[PDB]
Amino acid sequence: QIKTLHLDIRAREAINTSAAGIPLSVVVRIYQLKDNRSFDSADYQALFTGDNEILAGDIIAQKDVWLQPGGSVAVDMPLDDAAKFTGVAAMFLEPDQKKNTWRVVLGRDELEPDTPRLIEVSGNTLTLLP
């Protein structure tokens, strides 16, 4: 059904701001995952700097993209048939760990074969949008 993962990652002008309020580019990591449990349970430190081998076992493919303030990145990546979930996590300076707004996860049934899912980056948050 879905051969290709299509994402459109778009940044507002003010994203990932420093303490002085200056917008900064951000790395966004895209993960093709066999399962979601390890990814969803990982905290920011664990996901980005940790040695979780269960998480490593779940990751089929990963891409790191660099999103400029006011910019956009198109992801058009072969979707592995074993990728039941796609995780998208931003390496924000200031992630809101309490609200868990620094990452999103999509099941296969949330993707479209020939249309991208739009992910908005605004401040220190990611939001899936129509």
Numbering used by the authors: 22 to 151
Sentences from the paper on this structure:
Among the six secretion systems identified in Gram negative bacteria, the recently identified Type VI secretion system (T6SS) is composed of 13 core components which form a trans-envelope apparatus. We report here the crystal structure of the TssJ protein of the enteroaggregative Escherichia coli Sci1 T6SS which likely constitute a prototype for all TssJ-like proteins. We reported here the crystal structure of the TssJ lipoprotein, a critical core-component of Type VI secretion systems, and its interaction with TssM. TssJ is a β-sandwich resembling transthyretin with two additional elements: a protruding loop and a small helical domain.
The structure was solved from 2.0 Å resolution SIRAS (single isomorphous replacement with anomalous scattering) maps calculated using CsI as phasing agents, and the resolution limit was extended to 1.35 Å with the native data set. The polypeptide chain could be traced from residue Ile23 to Pro151. The segment 1-22 anchoring the protein to the membrane via Cys1 and its phospholipid thioester as well as the last four residues were not ordered in the crystal. A unique TssJ molecule is contained in the asymmetric unit, and the PISA server did not identify any sufficient interactions between TssJ molecules related by crystallographic symmetry. TssJ has the topology of a β-sandwich formed by two four-stranded β-sheets. The other face of β-sheet 2 one is covered in part by three short helices (h1-3) occurring between β-strands 2 and 3. Noteworthy, TssJ helical domain (residues 57-71) is absent in transthyretin, 5-hydroxy-isourate hydrolase and ExsB, but a single helix is located on the same face, between strands 4 and 5 of transthyretin. The extended loop (residues 38-45) between stands 1 and 2, forming a protruding extension, is also absent in the three proteins. A group of aromatic residues, Tyr65, Phe113 and Trp123 form also a structurally important hydrophobic cluster stabilizing the α-helical domain against the β-sandwich core. Coupled to the observation that TssJ-ΔL1-2 was correctly folded, we concluded that the L1-2 loop of TssJ is a critical determinant for the TssJ-TssM interaction. Collectively, the data from the in vivo and in vitro experiments demonstrate the existence of a 1∶1 stoichiometry complex between the C-terminal periplasmic domain of TssM and the TssJ lipoprotein, with a Kd of 2-4 µM.
